[PDB]
């Protein structure tokens, strides 16, 4: 039986038990001031954990958890509600000691019974994947401030995942179904509390100035602003112009042409607005176009390959995007687990038993999305697309691509959020037309796209694959057969090859020597099957803000660290007064 104050998914946590604060904070950061942010689309309720609805910005952060993660490590956990934990070396059980100072916003204590209540609330009224993941687990208050967690199989990551479960107050949540949207904020506990809102338009968070955990090491130097306000915009172009007029304080710029040509005006000449390009060498979010492979039009890997050949990234980057983007090419982008080289011996051991069910390129080639000459008319790529289509039974009848048996035109719908800039869409549609393929474009509002995304009610739609710094057991939610309805399986894949590799990843959790070939092997399977069409990423954060903030000397690796920023009185005094807005 061991006792610890910190845990890490791989290796050891960076911060010793006696640590005072994170390397990437200023412990003396002053409190006060407001930061105003934007959000795209709309929202209709306050329950992030419901089975439906459009949850408001930041409503995933309303609650403290047992342990909280550092932002400069891939997965290290430090005390928040918990003070410590005793556990067996096989990570099949843990007893978590609750800090007696822990409180909800109404001043009532957070107890072991609240943790037990919360686990059962998610098991019985949470999203379906929760009960599937935790079917073999129990969470029990064995003393007023000690929760015991027991797993049916050794599962370090299952255990640490529950360390991030929001701890609900039973006194409130006994009267609200977890699956139902909430028209008003729930009783919560975190350092910021919703204090006003306008449904669909804005949410205002206020700093909880007697926050019980304000001086814990994980919170020192953080949560400095007195007010965090989110204003919603239906149109990113409207949001961008509002930023430049001073309507909100900080913008993450995802539009290449905006960044290249439109950060102009006397607010920039007067140096009221700062631009920063922060390069990062860590795991990267990546953009893809999901093929719904449960729909007949995309059931054939050859058709998915042909449509991928029609996506001229080199032309798009040069002509539309100021060559800002890099091509997506891995589900572990910019990490050690990306399959950037030929398979090594250990990978071949894992893959050879499944060769009957694998594309042969998994063994013979390094995955590379198509490269075009960059003029929109890459002859080699488009002739190969035509041959793949022909071989798949989709032949030309005149200028139209039709099924060689039924005569049905090859046609599919691209589902798009109306809020996003999508300058690549007509170029893609034009390239497809030149293969005889019709792509209908359907732009829909924020709530509709959320509902349709969740149900996979699309032929194709853009998806973000969030940065995964190591092959996590969470891969099963997005890819394994049993979790098909989690809302995270974008292509709709149920493959025994994927299932077996992810089962091995889970059995090898914590073991980096084993996870390295397994992650690379899984990358090969997911990429070579063309389940999605790789779009782009960039290994940098393009940020602009009104010059009213100061920052710690060190930025975290895995977050922008805006929660470590503070309102700088000296800097703000030179800006025009917010009374003009």
The partner in contact with residue 433, picked from Mg ion, Cl ion, other proteins, none with C-beta cut-offs of 5 to 8 angstroms by kind, is none
Q: How far is the CB of 528 from other proteins (least distance, A)?
A: 24
| # chain residues binding other proteins, by CB under 8 A | 36
- Of residues 87 through 126, those in contact with Cl ion by CB under 5 A are none
Report if residue 122 touches other proteins, rule: CB under 8 A.
yes
Q: Which of Mg ion, other proteins, Cl ion, none binds 553 (CB below 5-8 Å, type-dependent)?
A: Cl ion
Contact status: 128 vs Mg ion (CB under 5 A) = yes
133 is a contact residue toward other proteins (CB under 8 A)? yes
Question: Does position 298 bind other proteins by CB under 8 A?
Answer: no
223 contacts which partner out of Cl ion, other proteins, Mg ion, none, CB within 5 to 8 A by kind?
Answer: none
CA–CA separation, 15 vs 12, rounded Å?
9
We find the least distance from the C-beta atom of residue 55 to Mg ion, in angstroms, to be 20
- By CB under 8 A, name the one of 78, 230, 428, 488 that touches other proteins: 488
Report the site for Mg ion in 468-487 (rule: CB under 5 A).
Answer: 485
Residue 186: CB minimum distance to other proteins, A: 14
Work out what residue 557 binds among Mg ion, other proteins, Cl ion, none; the CB cut-off runs from 5 to 8 Å by kind. none
DSSP character string of 267-280 = HHHTT-EEEEEEE-
Q: Count of alpha carbons within 13 Å of 439, Cβ hemisphere only?
A: 25
Handedness of CA 477, 479, 484, 487 (dihedral sign): positive
DSSP annotation string for 101-148 = T-B-TTSPBP-HHHHHHHHHHHHHHS-HHHHHHHTT-EEEEEETTEEE
Binding residue for Cl ion (CB under 5 A) from 74, 471, 552, 556? 552
3-state secondary structure of 35: strand
The nearer residue to other proteins, 444 or 575, going by C-beta atoms, is 444
- Provide the token pair at 452: 């349709």
Written as one string, the DSSP assignment of 295-325 is SGGG-SHHHHHHHHHT--HHHHHHHHSTT--
For position 162 contacting other proteins by CB under 8 A, the verdict is yes
Asked whether position 487 contacts other proteins by CB under 8 A, the answer is: yes
With contacts defined by CB under 5 A, name the span among 98-106, 120-128, 141-149, 382-390 that binds Mg ion: 120-128
Contact 191, 223 (CB under 8 A): yes
Binding range to other proteins, per CB under 8 A, among 306-314, 350-358, 485-493, 530-538: 485-493
**Considering only residues 67-86, where is the footprint of other proteins by CB under 8 A?**
69, 75
Contact pick of 13, 33, 41, 186 for other proteins (by CB under 8 A): 41
Q: Pull the structure tokens for residue 166.
A: 């929001």
Closer of 189 and 551 to Cl ion (Cβ)? 551
Least spacing, CB of residue 203 vs other proteins, in Å: 14
Structure tokens at 132: 């599937």
**By CB under 8 A, residue 134 contacts other proteins:** yes
Q: Which of 317, 486, 495, 529 binds other proteins (CB under 8 A)?
A: 486
Residue selected from 2, 4, 20, 60 as contacting other proteins according to rule CB under 8 A? 60
For helices 301-309 and 379-391, the axis angle rounded to 10 degrees is 160
The CA distance from 369 to 527, in Å, is: 9
Q: How far apart are CA 522 and CA 379, in angstroms?
A: 32
CB of 24 vs Cl ion, minimal distance in Å: 8
The smaller minimum CB distance to Cl ion, of residues 26 and 333, is found at: 26
- Reference 550, options 21, 23, 30; nearest CA is 30
Rg (CA), the chain: 25
3-state helix, strand, coil split of the chain in percent (to 5) is 30, 20, 50
87 or 134, CB closer to other proteins?
134
Q: With b meaning 16 or more CB within 10 Å and e meaning fewer, what string describes 416-427?
A: bbbbbbeebbeb
Residue 132 or 560 with smaller CB distance to Mg ion: 132
| CB of 25 or CB of 162, closer to Cl ion | 25
Q: Which does 485 bind (CB under 5 to 8 A by kind): Cl ion, other proteins, Mg ion, none?
A: Mg ion
Site for other proteins in 514-573 (CB under 8 A): none
What is d(CA 508, CA 381) in angstroms, rounded to the nearest whole number? Answer: 40
Q: Of these partners, Mg ion, other proteins, Cl ion, none, which one is at the site of residue 472 (CB under 5 to 8 Å by kind)?
A: other proteins
Alpha-carbon gap, residue 394 to 400, rounded angstroms: 10
Under 8 Å between Cβ of 80 and 64: yes
Check residue 477 for interaction with other proteins (CB under 8 A): yes
Tell which one of 9, 22, 26, 401 touches Cl ion (CB under 5 A): 26
Q: Show the 3-state SS of 476-527.
A: HHHHCHHHCCCCCCCCCCCCHHHHHHHHHHHHCCCCHHHHHHHHHHHHHHHH
Single out the residue of 6, 9, 273, 497 in contact with other proteins (rule: CB under 8 A): 9
List the structure tokens of 108.
């009532």
Contact criterion met (CB below 8 Å) for 110 and 124: no
- Rounded to whole angstroms, the Cα distance separating 150 from 116 reads 12
User: Of 106-114, 130-138, 381-389, 492-500, which part binds other proteins (CB under 8 A)?
Assistant: 130-138
Which residue, 38 or 551, has its beta carbon nearer to Cl ion?
551
Q: Does 120 bind other proteins (CB under 8 A)?
A: no
CA 249, CA 547: separation in Å to the nearest integer?
Answer: 9
Spatial CA neighbour of 430 closest among 504, 346, 319: 319
Tell whether residue 99 is a contact of other proteins (CB under 8 A).
no
Residues near Mg ion (CB under 5 A): 128, 485
Residues near other proteins (CB under 8 A): 9, 40-41, 48-51, 54-55, 60, 69, 75, 122, 126-127, 129-130, 133-134, 157, 160-162, 164-166, 450, 453-454, 472, 474, 477-478, 486-488
Residues near Cl ion (CB under 5 A): 26, 552-553
């Amino acid at each position: 039986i061991k006792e610890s104050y910190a845990f890490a998914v791989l290796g050891e946590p960076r911060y010793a038990f006696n640590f005072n604060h994170f390397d990437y904070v200023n412990p003396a950061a002053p409190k006060g001031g407001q930061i105003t942010l934007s959000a795209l689309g709309t929202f209709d309720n306050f329950n992030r954990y419901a089975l439906r609805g459009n949850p408001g910005a930041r409503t995933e952060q309303l609650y403290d958890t047992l342990f909280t993660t550092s932002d400069d490590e891939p997965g290290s956990y430090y005390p928040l509600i918990a003070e410590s934990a005793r556990y067996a070396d096989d990570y099949s059980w843990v007893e978590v000691a609750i800090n007696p100072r822990a409180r909800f916003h109404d001043g009532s204590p957070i107890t072991a019974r609240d943790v037990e209540f919360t686990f059962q609330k998610f098991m019985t009224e949470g999203v379906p994947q929760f009960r599937l993941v935790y079917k073999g687990t129990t969470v029990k208050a064995i003393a007023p401030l000690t929760v015991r967690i027991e797993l049916a199989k050794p599962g370090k990551e299952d255990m640490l995942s529950l360390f991030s479960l929001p701890v609900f107050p039973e006194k409130y949540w006994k009267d609200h179904k977890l699956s139902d949207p909430l028209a008003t904020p729930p009783l919560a506990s975190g350092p910021y509390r919703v204090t006003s809102w306008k449904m669909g338009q804005n949410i205002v968070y206020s700093r909880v100035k007697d926050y019980w955990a304000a001086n814990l090491p994980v919170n020192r130097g953080r949560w400095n602003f007195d007010t965090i306000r989110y204003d919603y915009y239906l149109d990113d172009n409207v949001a961008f112009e509002a930023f430049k007029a001073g309507a909100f304080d900080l913008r993450m710029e995802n539009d290449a042409k905006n960044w290249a040509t439109r950060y102009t005006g006397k607010n920039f000449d007067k140096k009221y607005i700062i631009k920063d390009e922060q390069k990062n060498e860590s795991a990267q979010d990546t953009r893809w176009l999901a093929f719904n492979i449960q729909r007949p039009v995309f059931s054939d890997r050859r058709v998915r390959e042909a449509i991928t050949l029609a996506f001229d990234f080199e032309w798009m980057n040069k002509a539309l995007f100021y060559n800002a983007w890099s091509r997506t090419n891995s589900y572990f982008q910019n990490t050690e687990y990306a399959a950037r080289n030929y398979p090594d011996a250990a990978e071949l051991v894992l893959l050879a038993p499944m060769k009957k069910d694998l594309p042969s390129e998994v063994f013979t080639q390094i995955y590379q999305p198509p490269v075009s000459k960059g003029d929109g008319y890459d002859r080699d790529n488009l002739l190969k697309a035509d041959k793949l289509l022909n071989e798949a039974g989709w032949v030309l009848k005149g200028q139209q691509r039709v099924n060689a048996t039924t005569g049905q035109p090859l046609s599919f719908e691209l589902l798009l959020p109306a809020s996003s800039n999508s300058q690549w869409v007509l170029p893609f549609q034009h390239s497809l037309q030149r293969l005889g393929i019709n792509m209908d474009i359907r732009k829909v509002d924020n709530s509709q796209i959320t509902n349709r995304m969740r149900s996979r009610d699309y032929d194709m739609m853009p998806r973000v694959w969030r940065a995964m710094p190591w092959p996590s057991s969470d891969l099963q939610i997005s890819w394994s057969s049993e979790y098909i309805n989690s809302t995270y399986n974008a292509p709709g894949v149920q493959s025994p090859v994927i299932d077996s590799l992810i089962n091995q990843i889970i059995a090898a959790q914590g073991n980096k020597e084993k996870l390295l070939p397994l992650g690379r092997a899984l990358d090969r399977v997911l990429t070579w099957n063309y389940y999605m069409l790789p779009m782009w990423y960039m290994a940098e954060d393009r940020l602009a803000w009104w010059d009213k903030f100061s920052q710690p000397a060190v930025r975290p690796i895995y977050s922008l660290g805006i929660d470590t920023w503070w309102y700088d009185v000296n800097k703000a005094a030179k800006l025009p007064s917010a009374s003009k807005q």
